[PDB]
């Protein structure tokens, strides 16, 4: 059922701090303990990210410019997919991605998306369990010049299915007609903010789609129970999650690979003058003195 | 000072100097000598400087 409600709420965009976030492997080369420096698009340190709350219909249009960061602190994986493109009204070609228990369908068709797309899961039906039910994400798929499926990509980490929360961390990059994705998931105990640590995001897939992308939708998969009346948009208004949005731009990071080849720490050459000193001097410890 | 001079001498081996790659084994194994000679010569001039 591709029908929606006129509005839910004028989303208050609460912000939070991305302490040490947006660090991902910029290359496909293993490196031992070295201090490399790459001119790749990262998320600048200590940047305000648009903390969107799931319980209150956080599924707006968001300009996807020069790549966009993404996280999700949640259990049971409320938010699933994304809807990219530059026109979104089937007039021009546009991307589409989903995620569910069948497989993560990735398509580039002249889709006609629904105003409130998500994945409804009518559960406790004839088996006292859960089973994906709804597919109200789009209506038409007339023209198409791409497709992909790999497997149901729901990376529920160990921990007996949500002792802590599953923190997805995702980078989507789109330059010179190549859609690039990096991902990692780590467990934490913090409920509202983000922890104090350095996370490195490995690549997972590239797309030869070359489609002009300027937005994304972040399918939240609205569902609470199979007895919630609604107009296919509201009714399933229950989200115990949150998802973050962060832009990317040129940031000449200075990456510190340890002996194990992992990016232990990083330095941003525009966060502050001291970090620019650490960059020009090309180290992490700066002795007393004056540097140009 | 000695260690820094040697380190920058090593690090200068990873520069293109205008060539298509900073390693000779990717120029020789991807270009016929007639037009690989110009890239090898660019690297020669840069590394010699």
């Amino acid at each position: 059922q591709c029908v929606n409600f006129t509005t839910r709420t004028q989303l208050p965009p609460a912000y939070t701090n991305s302490f040490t976030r947006g660090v991902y492997y910029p290359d496909k080369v293993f490196r031992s303990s070295v201090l490399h420096s790459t001119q790749d698009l990262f998320l600048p340190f200590f940047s305000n990210v648009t903390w969107f709350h799931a319980k209150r219909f956080a599924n707006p249009v968001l300009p996807f410019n020069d790549g966009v960061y993404f996280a999700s602190t949640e259990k049971s994986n409320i938010i699933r997919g994304w809807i990219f493109g530059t026109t979104l009204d089937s007039k021009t070609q546009s991307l589409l991605i989903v995620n569910n228990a069948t497989n993560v369908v990735i398509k580039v068709c002249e889709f006609q998306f629904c105003n409130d797309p998500f994945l409804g899961v009518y559960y406790h039906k004839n088996n006292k369990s859960w089973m994906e039910s709804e597919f109200r994400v789009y209506s038409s798929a007339n023209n198409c010049t791409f497709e992909y499926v790999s497997q149901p990509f729901l990376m529920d980490l160990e921990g007996k299915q949500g002792n802590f929360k599953n923190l997805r961390e995702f980078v989507f990059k789109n330059i010179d007609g190549y859609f690039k994705i990096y991902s990692k998931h780590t467990p934490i105990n913090l409920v509202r903010g983000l922890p104090q640590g350095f996370s490195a995001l490995e690549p997972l897939v590239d797309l030869p789609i070359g489609i002009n992308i300027t937005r994304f939708q972040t399918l939240l998969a609205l569902h609470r129970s199979y007895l919630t009346p609604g107009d296919s948009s509201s009714g399933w208004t229950a989200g115990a999650a949150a998802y973050y949005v962060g832009y990317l731009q040129p940031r000449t990071f200075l990456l510190k690979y340890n002996e194990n080849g992992t990016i232990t720490d990083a330095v941003d050459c525009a966060l502050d003058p001291l970090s620019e000193t650490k960059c020009t001097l090309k180290s992490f410890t700066v002795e007393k003195g004056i540097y140009q | 000072q000695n260690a820094q001079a040697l380190n920058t001498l090593v690090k200068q081996l990873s520069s293109n100097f205008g060539a298509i790659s900073s390693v000779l084994n990717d120029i020789l194994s991807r270009l016929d000598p007639p037009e690989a000679e110009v890239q090898i010569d660019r690297l020669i001039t840069g590394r010699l400087q």
Partner: protein, 292 residues
């Protein structure tokens, strides 16, 4: 006097184990090449990239390559390869090249400056030129600015000529984005259509499974060999190491950008490249007057 360096005792080739044959036969001999305003992105992959049937063959009017020698194409393993097939005019044959500005080189198809890869062209009088009128092939003229390389545009709206707003199907000072073609066998050079396919590689950054029928020689260790891993030549003394390569990490470099670690494309173990035990020789010498 001179320098002592050990010589390689063996030659080694280590390619992925594959037996498929690449779609070049289908790609080049397709039924009807698409219009130049919307070309095709056919991701050839996981096949023995035999370019012998490409360079030893005939009827290819122009087969010239940029950055890759045609005779080395049989020895290079590509991360990905793409076939951009379309039809152009005789005056556009030069325009399918890096730089070389023209009309279609600035309107509907552009190549980057590096363009690791090349193009193949041949006439299209025998298969396209009919006296009935080949208006089925078109191309865009201007989209208020220049386009970007390797990006398509299949939005068949009405774009204004400029300085005046219109709508509908026709307006004064408001044109139509496309322009038709007229291929007929009465045509000649500069007018007869040409069938152009564009190959674009991506070399020596990431692990690769697309390259020619070079026979993978057995693997030897602890001896000076002239190894060849996916086309990465070089002398070394292969040993075993414990460098924790991540699944997407093929190679491993040092400060001088020389690979000091490699992974077998057949048995995914972490090797340890190291050049031979070279050195310099000094010659202690009493004066030749006194002794020899």
């Amino acid at each position: 006097t001179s320098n002592f360096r050990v010589q390689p005792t063996e030659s080694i080739v280590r390619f992925p184990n594959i037996t498929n044959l690449c779609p070049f036969g289908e790609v080049f001999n397709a039924t009807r090449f698409a219009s130049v305003y919307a070309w095709n992105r056919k991701r050839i992959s996981n096949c023995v990239a035999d370019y012998s049937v490409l360079y030893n063959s005939a009827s290819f009017s122009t087969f010239k390559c940029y950055g890759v020698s045609p005779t080395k194409l049989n020895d290079l393993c590509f991360t990905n390869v793409y076939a951009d097939s379309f039809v152009i005019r005789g005056d556009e044959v030069r325009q399918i090249a890096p730089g070389q500005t023209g009309n279609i080189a600035d309107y509907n198809y552009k190549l980057p400056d590096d363009f690791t890869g090349c193009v193949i062209a041949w006439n299209s009088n025998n298969l396209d030129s009919k006296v009935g009128g080949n208006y089925n092939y078109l191309y865009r003229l201007f989209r208020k600015s220049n386009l970007k390389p390797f990006e398509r545009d299949i939005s068949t709206e009405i774009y204004q000529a400029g300085s005046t707003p219109c709508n509908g199907v026709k307006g004064f000072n408001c044109y139509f984005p496309l322009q038709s073609y007229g291929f007929q066998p009465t045509y000649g050079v500069g007018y007869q259509p040409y069938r152009v396919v564009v190959l674009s590689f991506e070399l020596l950054h990431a692990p690769a499974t697309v390259c020619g029928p070079k026979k993978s020689t057995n693997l030897v260790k602890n001896k000076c060999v002239n190894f060849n891993f996916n086309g990465l030549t070089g002398t070394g003394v292969l040993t075993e190491s414990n460098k924790k390569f991540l699944p997407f990490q093929q190679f491993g470099r040092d400060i001088a950008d020389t690979t000091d670690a490699v992974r077998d494309p057949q048995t995914l173990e972490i090797l340890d490249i190291t050049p031979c035990s070279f050195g310099g020789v000094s010659v202690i010498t009493p004066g030749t007057n006194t002794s020899n």
